[PDB]
Amino acid sequence: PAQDNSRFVIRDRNWHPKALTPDYKTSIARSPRQALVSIPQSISETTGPNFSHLGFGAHDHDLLLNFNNGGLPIGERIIVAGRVVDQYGKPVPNTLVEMWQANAGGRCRHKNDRYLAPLDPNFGGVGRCLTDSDGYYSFRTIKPGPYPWRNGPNDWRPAHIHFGISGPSIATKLITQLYFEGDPLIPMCPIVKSIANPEAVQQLIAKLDMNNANPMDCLAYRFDIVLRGQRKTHFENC
Amino acid sequence: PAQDNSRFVIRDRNWHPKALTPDYKTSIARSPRQALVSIPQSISETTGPNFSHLGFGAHDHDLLLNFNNGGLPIGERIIVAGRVVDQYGKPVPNTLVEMWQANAGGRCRHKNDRYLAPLDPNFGGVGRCLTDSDGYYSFRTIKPGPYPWRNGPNDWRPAHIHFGISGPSIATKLITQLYFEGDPLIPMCPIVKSIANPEAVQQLIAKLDMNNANPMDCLAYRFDIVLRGQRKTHFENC
Amino acid sequence: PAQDNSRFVIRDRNWHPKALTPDYKTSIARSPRQALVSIPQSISETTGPNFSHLGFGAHDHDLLLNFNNGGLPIGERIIVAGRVVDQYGKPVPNTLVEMWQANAGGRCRHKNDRYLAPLDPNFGGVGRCLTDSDGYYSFRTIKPGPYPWRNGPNDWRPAHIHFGISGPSIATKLITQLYFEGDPLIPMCPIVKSIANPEAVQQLIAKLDMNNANPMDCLAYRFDIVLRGQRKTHFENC
Amino acid sequence: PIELLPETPSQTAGPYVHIGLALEAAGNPTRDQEIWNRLAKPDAPGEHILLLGQVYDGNGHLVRDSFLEVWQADANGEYQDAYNLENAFNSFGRTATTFDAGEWTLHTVKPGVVNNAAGVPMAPHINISLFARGINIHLHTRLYFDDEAQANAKCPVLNLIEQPQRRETLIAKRCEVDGKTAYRFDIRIQGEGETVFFDF
Amino acid sequence: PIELLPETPSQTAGPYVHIGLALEAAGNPTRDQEIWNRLAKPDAPGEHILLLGQVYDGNGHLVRDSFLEVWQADANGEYQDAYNLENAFNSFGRTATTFDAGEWTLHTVKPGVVNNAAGVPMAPHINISLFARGINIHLHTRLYFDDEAQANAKCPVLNLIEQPQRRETLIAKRCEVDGKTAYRFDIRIQGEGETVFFDF
Amino acid sequence: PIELLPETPSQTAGPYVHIGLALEAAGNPTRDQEIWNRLAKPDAPGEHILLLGQVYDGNGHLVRDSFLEVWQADANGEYQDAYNLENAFNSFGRTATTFDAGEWTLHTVKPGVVNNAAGVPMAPHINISLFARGINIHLHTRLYFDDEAQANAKCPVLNLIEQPQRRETLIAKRCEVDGKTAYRFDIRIQGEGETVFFDF
Amino acid sequence: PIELLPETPSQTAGPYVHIGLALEAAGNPTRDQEIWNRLAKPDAPGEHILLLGQVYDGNGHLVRDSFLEVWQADANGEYQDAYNLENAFNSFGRTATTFDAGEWTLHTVKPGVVNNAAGVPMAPHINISLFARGINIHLHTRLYFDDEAQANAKCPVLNLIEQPQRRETLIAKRCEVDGKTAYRFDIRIQGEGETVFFDF
Numbered sequence A, B, C: 001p002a003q004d005n006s007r008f009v010i011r012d013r014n015w016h017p018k019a020l021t022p023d024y025k026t027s028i029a030r031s032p033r034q035a036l037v038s039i040p041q042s043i044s045e046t047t048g049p050n051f052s053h054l055g056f057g058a059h060d061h062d063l064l065l066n067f068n069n070g071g072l073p074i075g076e077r078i079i080v081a082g083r084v085v086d087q088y089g090k091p092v093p094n095t096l097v098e099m100w101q102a103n104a105g106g107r108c109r110h111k112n113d114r115y116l117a118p119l120d121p122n123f124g125g126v127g128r129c130l131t132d133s134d135g136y137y138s139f140r141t142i143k144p145g146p147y148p149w150r151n152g153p154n155d156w157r158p159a160h161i162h163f164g165i166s167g168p169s170i171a172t173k174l175i176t177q178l179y180f181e182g183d184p185l186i187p188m189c190p191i192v193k194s195i196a197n198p199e200a201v202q203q204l205i206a207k208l209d210m211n212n213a214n215p216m217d218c219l220a221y222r223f224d225i226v227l228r229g230q231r232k233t234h235f236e237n238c
Numbered sequence D, E, F, G: 001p002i003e004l005l006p007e008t009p010s011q012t013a014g015p016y017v018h019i020g021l022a023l024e025a026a027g028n029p030t031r032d033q034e035i036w037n038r039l040a041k042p043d044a045p046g047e048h049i050l051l052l053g054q055v056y057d058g059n060g061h062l063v064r065d066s067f068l069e070v071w072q073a074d075a076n077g078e079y080q081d082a083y084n085l086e087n088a089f090n091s092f093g094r095t096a097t098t099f100d101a102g103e104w105t106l107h108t109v110k111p112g113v114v115n116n117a118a119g120v121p122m123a124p125h126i127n128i129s130l131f132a133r134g135i136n137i138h139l140h141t142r143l144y145f146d147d148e149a150q151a152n153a154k155c156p157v158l159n160l161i162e163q164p165q166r167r168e169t170l171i172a173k174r175c176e177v178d179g180k181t182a183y184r185f186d187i188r189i190q191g192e193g194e195t196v197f198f199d200f
């Protein structure tokens, strides 16, 4: 079983987006009015699931082949790779990185998405990968296209891939979004602007990686994820 | 018939790309070693075709419908609009604007293109439009994806749409390329870098136009084209 | 009848003042807690009243003469003129511009105004004008004086003239306030501070216009108004 | 991106909005031609109705200084843009709530059906714009009728409001004031039963 | 002061969270192994319970697109981190509320007692993380049980909540669903009876 | 000095120029009306000629992806700017060299005489603009004829070329293709016998 | 974009390249173990060949100061990376052209077939790297054989060279020097008959 031997660096809730961000409309009715109750870390908070024993299919990380009904998806073939480290710069091995996205046109494979851009019969948009010993993950997919949404009258989400990172604990567990370098829609999105600090928005921008690109085949993007720093317990209860 | 009543501003061949640009490999064997012979402008150079009487089909400007085999193309639905003016800022009416591009994956509909990204059965990539009285044109298409090419070992063309502009004369006739705002591949392309002046590269960057976008439908890009200034003849042959 | 041929550029609600601005005390109880519901533009939103056939009195725009009980108002005689354009810089012709203000001492002609500065027996404070072919409007009035109000214990409104502009649609309809160049009360007022962006406040400041002033008579202030950009519909419902 | 000229920013209409836009409601003398609450002359086509309502703040207290502007189609579902006081029907009108009358009134006909951009029929509605002290930028809303339930259930605009309970705030309750067909439409700016406001 | 590398900022899970994290609930085809609501297999030790609840927003309306992640100890009060579908019990599980099912379900056993860092026993609880559109950074909460009144009064985490009326929002009510032992835990994100959320 | 707005920079036509400007040559389906190599219809006035040529690069190798645009006067020496496919003659036309046909063809009439700006008669010529991959900005040239020796010696544009050996590169040789009058005009972009290119 | 550490820039090998890399070719004393032109010992498997050639500049004059490095697979199509002078065959070797010997020599076996990344068989080749004064960054080339015409026509690398005439510059002509199988491979750095150089 799991033990209480780790302490996690307290989250900077001024770096992270606030609960109440008015421009992002749905946050108004879905944000607590009462203050969060601070509790010390215990075994309930400092431990979490390990997904090393989960049965991963061969194409779970490859979105170009994991839906396959008879062909290849239409769109810009890209590799989305990066490293998962903690605040101390320590790699996070054997961690679950889950991702989901829209197709080249910005259409998501869900019943609630009635956007006029057609579905790609060869694209699912779901991906999962367990990080290696050095904390590296890699996905092969197509660059998702931007999509409109009912927030403001002309609000468009920048091209993005949603990310879900488990980490060593439920305390480190994080769901975020990846944006693409140079996309002019980034400073205009209310979901991006929910983050007050501009330096924090930069941590979400995946950068073009020509070094990791496959010549005459696919481009690449680097997205490094930083999770809460893990430290050993010291001087607790004397 | 056409008459000799106009003079065109002499082309700044230091603004325009040079014939010999080594990094763009094919230019080495396809560039003149001898100097261009300067000739005065005459009726042969100052006149050109007028395409007002050409039979344009209803969807010639709409690349989302001009190929139609049973559906819509997969990709980011966009409007590429702009104005065609001359160096004096005077609009260029009833001029032919022709364009061609790749699909969302960077695949062109030609036999010589053996790129692994699939063809879109609902996308042709050919478009034409005659400018209005104010010099405005508009195309509805999908955002083309970048594509690799055999130049350097890892050379990738930025997402682009090729443009062909007729103008009032064969002297104004121009073929160029449109690039998209923020695309990180622009400062890396040898075809873009064939233009020495960085301020000239900026004239080729189509900018995001949220004002011309159709809410819940398609985005828009503005690309203004500037042709050689047209002036009346004065004090010729005394 | 009116037709659905125009589309209007979406309002920047971060440029405009927010609903909840606590320093302006009355806004606390009169601001919606729920988010605004975004709806697309239809004939109900893109059309609006045309006041070209409304019967304007000869002195409707002239506040020095439209109250007249036997004399001229006490105060700094000024001309308030300008142009009403849209975001594209296109003039807005035949539009209704309405205005109201206080006298030279800050006293408004209303029953609830029990400010100890007297009323001017020759001043009402109401005006209306229809813009010409080129979008120009003009008013003749006296410069209003600042007035105190029960917000903070020592709160003073700067010298202002309220403006009401209709535009081509109910989408463009706007009510605003004009302030005067150099007034030291402008950066101290909670109603002016309701606007977050200081460059937005600058558009509300009327600039002294010595060129439009009548020598030995009255001064002039120029106040240009910019309404939402109007564009024709394109590529709707394919 | 393309930056256009910025729109002139909005400011509150102020506590004295009535002196410049609702001269009679204030108590000040009127001009020859005023834009007021009589949209339809007694001889206008369609079902003649009286609209009334009160505006409430977040504390449940009456707003006795509000100014409202309305825009609606005629009985045939056509928008009459050319405002003239000689017309039987005008699509535009103005009303207000004062300290002497905490209830606004509007004399008009029931609007006909109009299609949206997509060609889908919208339910009979009146477009409202609310201005008052404390309201920095005006509030847009729509007035729907309770006796048009079948059309209300199929309206594209009303169906854009996620929650069914919030759609009811835009529906005016039918009553009778001295043998005349009347609809009551109370606007609650903030709090319990808050009226749906639009952006376009 | 000493500054470490900044943590990657959180963003909302979005409306379509289910296509990537709850495939069956999204009506999309599943992969061989999925992480879902069946924490305990029928032959697992402890009192087998069914957990259900609804998520309410600030207007008292149902959140039909929420995604919940649970972390709990087994019947013996031990955390099983090694996730495998062949196991009789898994301490982790995911559940969701959909448009087809506005109520979330969880099949598990009642957790045993675990001590805090100071050695003081905490009452039987389930750690819940709530994700959805509109929630920028996930909300952490705990599910306590009503039949553990003696243990709940002594819990060091529950006693950190200043007001005793707010502690009640974390207590699941015992009920019965189809002749099986069940507990109802409704979460109110905002307003009247707002659920206590934690920071750690 | 006075600076005007800068002209939009040129870029190469690229390898796939044909899909947008020579649809039939690209093996792609054509539209109703296309701009192609048939300048003159069989019943057009003047001496009907067939023009053919090959484009060579600096290594003496064929350019099988070139795109050429021609501008010429009619038999009467007048420029017909009004392009229409119903016309007997069109002064404009497009031709190309493909991988399937490394030679370009043009069906037209021999142009008449036109004067320069100074009133001096220029010899019968065809204005050619050459586009292809590797050509950053198009090359302008002129096609003169060998049986017009007297007119070619007097031409003011041809006499602006300093060396008489370079003037020969602009002179098309008279030949016969299938019992029809033809002229061969080969273009050498670089090297030995390099074609004279113009700037105007 | 992601900027990695930049590679150390290249500089010419200089006129005295032989003193540090071709000690015997210079005329300076050698060390115990040198990397030279004897890739295959007389007892190595496969068809034993002698390779010779001259390096020419752009004026058609001999380069009497060049340095060449070679890399090839053995007769079985395997690359032997572990360089040792005790091995029968070494995949790596060095040769040069001096003022005393304007012709470089190489004693090796004919390389076997190797597959590219895609699994397609490449024709028998020797990878060459040319260094000399005036050559700022080394020139990469390949040596193919004329008696392997069927394999040369199906090689993916040789077929990447657009023009067929340029493919012939990479093909070594078979001859006989004292009963030994010999292939002549002249490298023309610039001008007429210029050798194809690669980038990878």
Ligand SMILES: [Fe+3]
Binding pocket: C160, C162, D014, D016
């Ligand atoms: Fe005021």
Ligand SMILES: [Fe+3]
Binding pocket: A160, A162, E014, E016
């Ligand atoms: Fe999304």
Ligand SMILES: [Fe+3]
Binding pocket: B160, B162, F014, F016
């Ligand atoms: Fe291209």
Ligand SMILES: [Fe+3]
Binding pocket: G014, G016
């Ligand atoms: Fe040296």
